[PDB]
Design a protein around this ligand. Sequence first.
Ligand SMILES: Nc1ncnc2c1ncn2[C@@H]1O[C@H](COP(=O)(O)OP(=O)(O)OP(=O)(O)O)[C@@H](O)[C@H]1O
Ligand SMILES: Nc1ncnc2c1ncn2[C@@H]1O[C@H](COP(=O)(O)OP(=O)(O)OP(=O)(O)O)[C@@H](O)[C@H]1O
Lengths: 223, 221
Amino acid sequence: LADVAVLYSGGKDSNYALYWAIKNRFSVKFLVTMVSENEESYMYHTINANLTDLQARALGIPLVKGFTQGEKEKEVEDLKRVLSGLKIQGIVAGALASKYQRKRIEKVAKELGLEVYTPDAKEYMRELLNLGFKIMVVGVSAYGLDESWLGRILDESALEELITLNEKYKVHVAGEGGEFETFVLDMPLFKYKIVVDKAKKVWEPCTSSGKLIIEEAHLESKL
Amino acid sequence: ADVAVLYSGGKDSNYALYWAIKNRFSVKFLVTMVSENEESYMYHTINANLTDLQARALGIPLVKGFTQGEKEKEVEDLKRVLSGLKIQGIVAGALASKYQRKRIEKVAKELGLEVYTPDAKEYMRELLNLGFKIMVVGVSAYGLDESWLGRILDESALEELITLNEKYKVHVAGEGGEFETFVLDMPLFKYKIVVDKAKKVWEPCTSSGKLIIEEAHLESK
Ligand SMILES: Nc1ncnc2c1ncn2[C@@H]1O[C@H](COP(=O)(O)OP(=O)(O)OP(=O)(O)O)[C@@H](O)[C@H]1O
Ligand SMILES: Nc1ncnc2c1ncn2[C@@H]1O[C@H](COP(=O)(O)OP(=O)(O)OP(=O)(O)O)[C@@H](O)[C@H]1O
């Protein structure tokens, strides 16, 4: 019952769920990433869904990639199929999920007889920084988050800026409202560190939003 | 019934999959090992991280396991990645070397899993007849120059291999690491792969080389 699988999307919440699972002495048998063909997927994220391989390699944990069209409800089922093929007793995911996701996750879990573990934005983000998380902003979609944020690493100064934007424009500290997206380059659990060698940011002025596409990165020893 | 196919992305891996499907096996997973040991006698390493693109074309879940390449960790690292799968057996390419076969049979036996394994000139001609679109991404044998990197293995190319087999004894099927390949298209593939950017890296010190596929995308068919 300690054998679990963590739904991993590469961001700060997925990596914290993983941190959490291991710290609570759970046995994360697999990292599971769903690769949706549809960009507007309601269940899964597409951002850096191809870079998870790097994090999995840095972690040493087996990675399971499932491929789906990303259609409304057909998605939950696709996950179900992938999960039923794994020898696990439970599944972990980031607590920042939504009632829509949370509900559907719990649904498939009950259909497979699996437990569902889901572990203040300010104390949260600060906790991640104190745990050694190296979070890089790879997406922005909210007034106050200009293109300059793309690719920036979230430290204490950065967090203080977000605080200011929160007071001025109601920007959620931890991006709970989807103000920005992230990708974890390093964390104490990573055996190696992810180093971005080349990347480009795609910007859309029609909605004043953008993303940092990492198109070249490697791993570096940590000792 | 339920099995996992050891998939490296090469011709033999792809034929193992084709073989398993046609023989009424239920391919629940494709398993790709990623090793840091560029010169391992266990796994094909060139473009090892490209299987994701093929798996996406097939519509079959992929399991990526990792290993530093230490020969003393070959069995335990592969075992770690298979032990957690609800499978009754595993499929391996029919051309797996003895060095490989032993390791595979050991890990299988330790997991209680079965091992399913499917004339070089005949074997190759069949793959072409089956519609396999094979690109050479690595070579290492006297007689094989850099011109082979990136080349598409068609009937014309096969005859050249047969010729080289006569002249320098090069293995027509590439066993023993003589050459490595990458399957761009196959019948089971829903989409075909197209290479958009690649880098040829030649090793003069051993007169060998490899093609690093840098960019690629799926195209309709
Ligand atoms: N593509 C995906 N594949 C598998 N699990 C996913 C995927 N996307 C999200 N999840 C899981 O569901 C949770 C909710 O993700 P959500 O869409 O809210 O974005 P997020 O919280 O920013 O993602 P991340 O955990 O990477 O930070 C994640 O914490 C993770 O466990
Ligand atoms: N990285 C790997 N991960 C999982 N299985 C592998 C890996 N490398 C080899 N194998 C398995 O062992 C067999 C032998 O590998 P080999 O390199 O000879 O063939 P291949 O990779 O399938 O095709 P080719 O040699 O033409 O590139 C494969 O058929 C496959 O089943």
